[PDB]
Amino acid sequence: AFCNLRMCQLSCRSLGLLGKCIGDKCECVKH
Numbered sequence: 136a137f138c139n140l141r142m143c144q145l146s147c148r149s150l151g152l153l154g155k156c157i158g159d160k161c162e163c164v165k166h
Contacts, residue, residue, distance in 0.1 A: 138156035147154030147163035154163050 138158065138161065140154065140156045143154035143156040143161035143163075145154070146161060150163060152163035152165055154161055156162070
């Protein structure tokens with residue numbers, strides 16, 4: 136749906152990471 140990239144980025148970014156938001160769910164690449 137609207138996999139919310141802003142939230143995903145934030146939550147990932149808390150772990151340093153680069154949030155990118157897949158169909159189902161948020162993921163977090165490193166670089």
